[PDB]
Design a protein around this ligand. Structure first.
Ligand SMILES: [Mg+2]
Ligand SMILES: [Mg+2]
Ligand SMILES: [Mg+2]
Ligand SMILES: [Mg+2]
Ligand SMILES: [Zn+2]
Ligand SMILES: [Zn+2]
Ligand SMILES: [Zn+2]
Ligand SMILES: [Zn+2]
Lengths: 36, 63, 61, 129, 196, 89, 229, 152
RNA sequence: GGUAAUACCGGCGGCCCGAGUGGUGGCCACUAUUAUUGGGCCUAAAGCGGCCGUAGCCGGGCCCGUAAGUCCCUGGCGAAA
RNA sequence: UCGCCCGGUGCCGUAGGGAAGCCGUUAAGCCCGCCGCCUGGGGAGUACGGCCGCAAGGCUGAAACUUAAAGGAAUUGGCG
């Protein structure tokens, strides 16, 4: 997914393993719900 | 003086071994890669082992 | 200011490189002779380089 | 692999003399290397040198005097016109005649100070000061 | 030649070294025992003791240092200090003796004698900072870094540290006119060594 | 491209509020009673151009560089700023 | 040039010397500034310099480069400290730079000025530029460079009349040493004045590590220390 | 370093600098040419002819004598063989490499999951092609020749 | 800047340029923040997960030729402003 | 068991380099080569397009706008 290790640093954010999983769900909804 | 790193020189010699059951005189190598046998009779003179051979005759010189 | 060779600068007796104002050099009279003064720069003292007196032949540390 | 036997020599010389050595061995010995030693000698930077043959391209023994600050190779080997020397002398050397700049002119190898007397140019190969 | 007979250098153990080498000491080593323990030269210990004696007899006698932090080389430091006019500091060399003028023990020498450059490295550093020659007793394991005159000698045993300082203290007398001949030094060697 | 523009014959200071320079120029203006500052920088430039000319004829060598060298002395002493014995340096 | 020659006589009498160099200077064996340097001595009394270079304390051979105040934390507040950076030198060949600390601005300046004298060095001057080829001690005789911290400094010779075109603090240091013309090239962060100052100091010291033949001297004008006061 | 691995390694043979044959030799040039030709007809590789001359007959390398028919060149084993017509029909470097990549190619036909051996095959073929490019360039190999593995 | 403002708004002093002096937009230097001269890539931005190879750039020592690159001298040119 | 030469694998360490932590002939040193990537923090590895995969997914990859810091190596304390 071409990610950058600056974001696994957790200081003022949430975890990135869990932002990935949430971007993937939207990239799905834009695909099925008439992504054609 | 004159380090080995410039003009390298070997560590192995040419011998002038002399046979046992043949009397013949020859020249051989000290670190052979084969089985040096006599040039008339056929008995071995040196044997190949790793680094330096283990000769089996009488030496006359180191040449 | 009366420049008749007002001074000269000392040089190391092994390499010939003159000595900077504040380094850990040394000088002393030649052992075994007593007639020559011997200089050693900091870098020839640190890696122990041999010297030899310019008058007799006595050598090294 | 090996690409330049002259650069290796000049870096070896300036690395050795910086720690106090009094002899070096320039192993792969061209005659360009010998020709540049010849002009490093006439200006008083090295002592005496000899060519020793070893069956494979020969070696060079040279004695140092602790009289050089820096030596190196001008690599891309630019060309120079006979009236454009100062532009390069202001780039490599530290004052208006401090040291030599070695030039591969069409009449041999020489320092730029003797090229300006004949008025010729050529390729720059190295510099010593 | 041979300030003492060879059977007396060897009897002390001046020549016994250690199981560690160094490229600096490579000219003072002599061979290797099959045990793996190096042996020093003795002709060189002699020919260096003479030079060290006639070099030290050129300073004003109240401006010498003998130092030792080991325990076996402390009584030979005081006797050497008393026979010549030199000064001696046995025990711990507390720092700032040559650098701090705010201390009661301030003293600036002209040379300094070091028994072991490894155990006595504080005084070695303080001597580098001041620019005075250094005369040291080197063993097979030490480096010659900053040493200006070396003396190859087993500098650890108890009977060898007394034979070195004895010879050095005698030869200093013979070179400044305090003595006529070498056999006019009537002080037995046992007075130098530390008692068991 | 574009045609010729007429240019200014003086130069302003790089920073306008350096104290050790306002202090140095406040003296030359009361001693000679010049009207404004732009009247003072013009003379500084008249001098800096001479100086920058002598720096180029000093490294240079050739046939006409010689001719340009001794036209600088000739005028520079026709103007009373040098004596009759002065060399380029 | 006398007002600083009765100062020497006054100090040379009520000063009881405690090291060897002080003894030598008091007994008239050492009598010039130029012969305490290239020998490996140690300089621990500031009065070796008030007697051999008296005009070093002339209030126009002194300079205060910066004043800072710094802090350390504790369960009862903030413990504050000063830091002065000072340099001294006669404008002929000799310069020194020191720092010194305290709790007040006055004590800190005193220590700065004091330590500046003990960290003194002598340099070389000349003229090595391509444009001006005079032979006069007004600039640096050749290109030299020095470094400190994260600052890299290079100094290049320049022609006679051009100012000292270097940063804001380099002028003080270079002008106390006797230079008057230079060019410059810098890298690193030049806004930490301690490291920038110590880089310029290191360059002026490195002036005397370059090997030179006796023919270069009567081509660049190289003088060491005073050059005809 | 090595071509494919990167270990250094330094083992090799270190020769003395010398121009003329040694004094204790007694084999003249023709007595050595006959020796060189006698052994090839026992089926000996041009590398293993020199080993035997050096070990048993006591001849240090044959590159000490000049070429009898030519003062420029020096004598080499391959230049003796081509004098009699016995020299190989393909450079034997290439032949050894090609022959070693033919019984590895029938091992890899019964063990097709031996994935660590089939990398050595790719590396051998890389070497074969590196050599064919050079030989074609120097005219030792006719230009209508290609390494086709399905033959031999 | 929170009822004790050298920082806002007026008075009176002072400073910089001066027939000018300020405001908004654009390009260059500042910037070694585009790096041929002349930057970076362990922890700050940044070494492909690893290896094989086609084009291209870089290539060991000596001897004899050629004169394309390169260097010096000389004729015809590169309008005026 | 001891000594030496060559190649691998570890540690303490001179000169030197670095902002330091620390690297130091198994370089992060001084040189000669070739290729890949970097240009304040977010928006964003997103939208739109293309090529692969049976799908899950891989590879390529901007701008409107918004912000004055975001990052690194080490100090004195307070705290668990
Ligand atoms: Mg950068
Ligand atoms: Mg990173
Ligand atoms: Mg070539
Ligand atoms: Mg025109
Ligand atoms: Zn037999
Ligand atoms: Zn020296
Ligand atoms: Zn002597
Ligand atoms: Zn000048």
């Amino acid at each position: 997914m071409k990610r950058r290790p600056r974001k696994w640093k957790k200081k003022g954010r949430m975890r990135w393993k869990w932002i990935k999983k949430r971007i993937r769900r939207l990239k799905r909804q834009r695909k099925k719900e008439r992504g054609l | 003086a004159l380090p080995r790193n410039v003009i390298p020189m070997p560590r192995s010699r040419f011998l002038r071994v002399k046979c046992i059951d043949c009397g013949n005189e020859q020249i051989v190598f000290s670190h052979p890669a084969t089985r040096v046998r006599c040039n008339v009779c056929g008995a071995t003179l040196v044997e190949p082992t790793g680094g330096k051979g283990i000769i089996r005759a009488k030496i006359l010189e180191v040449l | 200011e009366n420049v008749e060779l007002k001074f000269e600068i000392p040089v190391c007796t092994s390499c010939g490189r003159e000595i900077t104002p504040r380094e850990h050099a040394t000088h002393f009279v030649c052992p075994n002779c007593g007639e020559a003064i011997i200089w050693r720069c900091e870098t020839c003292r640190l890696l122990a380089k041999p010297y030899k007196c310019p008058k007799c032949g006595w050598e090294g540390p | 692999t090996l690409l330049d036997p002259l650069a290796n020599a000049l870096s070896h010389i300036t690395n050795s003399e910086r720690v106090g050595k009094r002899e070096v061995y320039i192993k792969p010995a061209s005659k360009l290397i010998g020709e540049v030693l010849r002009v490093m000698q006439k200006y008083g930077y090295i002592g005496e040198f000899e060519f020793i043959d070893d069956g494979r391209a020969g070696v060079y023994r040279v004695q140092l005097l602790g009289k050089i600050n820096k030596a190196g190779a001008i690599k891309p080997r630019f060309p120079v016109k006979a009236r454009d020397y100062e532009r390069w002398e202001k780039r490599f050397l530290p004052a208006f005649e401090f040291g030599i700049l070695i030039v591969s002119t069409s009449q041999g190898v020489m320092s730029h100070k003797e090229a300006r007397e004949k008025g010729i140019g050529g390729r720059l190969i190295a510099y010593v000061y | 030649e041979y300030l003492v007979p060879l059977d007396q250098y060897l009897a002390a153990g001046v020549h016994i070294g250690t199981q560690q080498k160094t490229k600096d000491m490579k000219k003072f080593i002599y061979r290797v025992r099959q045990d793996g323990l190096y042996v020093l030269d003795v002709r060189k210990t002699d020919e260096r003791l003479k030079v060290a004696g006639k070099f030290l007899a050129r300073f004003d006698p109240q401006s010498i240092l003998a130092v030792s932090v080991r325990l076996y080389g402390q009584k030979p430091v005081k006797k050497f200090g008393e026979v010549t006019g030199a000064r001696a500091i046995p025990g711990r060399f507390l720092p700032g003796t040559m650098t701090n003028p705010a201390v009661k023990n301030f003293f600036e020498p002209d040379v300094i004698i070091i028994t072991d450059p490894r155990a006595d490295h504080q005084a070695m550093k303080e001597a580098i900072e001041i620019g005075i020659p250094i005369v040291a007793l080197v063993d097979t394991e030490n480096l010659l870094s900053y040493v200006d005159l070396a003396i190859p000698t087993n500098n650890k045993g108890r009977k060898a540290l007394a034979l070195i300082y004895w010879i050095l203290a005698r030869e200093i007398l013979y070179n400044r006119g305090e003595i006529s001949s070498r056999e006019e030094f009537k002080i037995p060697v046992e007075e130098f060594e530390m008692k068991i | 491209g574009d045609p010729k523009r007429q240019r200014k014959k003086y130069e302003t200071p790089p920073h306008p509020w350096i104290k050790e320079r306002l202090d140095r120029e406040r003296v030359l203006m009361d001693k000679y009673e010049l009207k404004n500052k732009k009247e003072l920088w013009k003379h500084e430039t008249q001098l800096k151009n001479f100086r920058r000319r002598a720096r180029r004829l000093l490294a240079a060598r050739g046939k006409q560089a010689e001719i340009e060298r001794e036209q600088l002395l000739a005028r520079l002493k026709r103007l009373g700023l040098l004596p009759e014995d002065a060399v380029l340096d | 040039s006398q007002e600083w020659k009765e100062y020497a006589k006054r100090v040379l009498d009520e000063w009881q010397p405690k090291t060897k160099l002080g003894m030598l200077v008091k007994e008239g064996q050492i009598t010039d500034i130029h012969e305490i340097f290239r020998k490996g001595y140690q300089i621990k009394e500031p009065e070796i310099i008030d007697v051999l270079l008296p005009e070093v304390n002339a209030r126009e051979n002194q300079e205060i480069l910066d004043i800072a105040l710094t802090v350390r934390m504790t369960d009862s507040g903030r413990r504050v400290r000063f830091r002065v950076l000072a340099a001294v030198g006669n404008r002929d060949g000799y310069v020194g730079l020191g720092i010194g600390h305290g709790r007040e601005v006055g004590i800190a300046i005193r220590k700065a000025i004091n330590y500046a004298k003990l960290n003194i060095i002598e340099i070389k001057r000349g003229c090595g530029s391509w444009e001006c080829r005079c032979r006069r001690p007004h600039s640096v005789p050749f290109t030299v460079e020095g470094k400190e911290g994260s600052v890299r400094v290079k100094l290049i010779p320049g022609p006679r009349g051009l100012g000292l075109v270097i940063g804001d603090v380099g002028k003080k240091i270079l002008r106390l040493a006797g230079i008057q013309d230079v060019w410059s090239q810098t890298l690193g962060e030049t806004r930490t004045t301690v490291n920038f100052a110590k880089a310029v100091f290191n360059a002026l010291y490195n002036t005397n590590k370059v090997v030179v033949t006796p023919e270069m001297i009567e081509r660049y004008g190289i003088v060491v220390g005073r050059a005809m006061p | 370093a090595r071509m494919h691995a990167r270990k250094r390694g330094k083992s090799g043979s270190k020769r003395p600098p010398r121009t003329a044959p040694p004094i204790w030799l007694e084999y003249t040039v023709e007595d050595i040419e006959n020796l060189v030709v006698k052994l090839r007809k026992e089926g000996y590789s041009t590398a293993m002819i020199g080993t035997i001359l050096r070990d048993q007959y006591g001849i240090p390398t044959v590159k000490l004598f000049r070429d009898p028919d030519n003062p420029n060149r020096k004598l080499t084993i391959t230049r003796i063989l081509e004098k009699h017509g016995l020299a190989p029909e393909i450079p034997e470097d290439l032949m050894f490499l090609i022959k070693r990549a033919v019984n590895l190619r029938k091992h890899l036909e019964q063990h097709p999951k031996d994935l660590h051996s089939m990398r050595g095959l790719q590396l051998i073929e890389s070497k074969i092609r590196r050599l064919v490019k050079y030989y074609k360039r120097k005219g030792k190999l006719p230009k209508d020749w290609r390494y086709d593995p399905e033959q031999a």
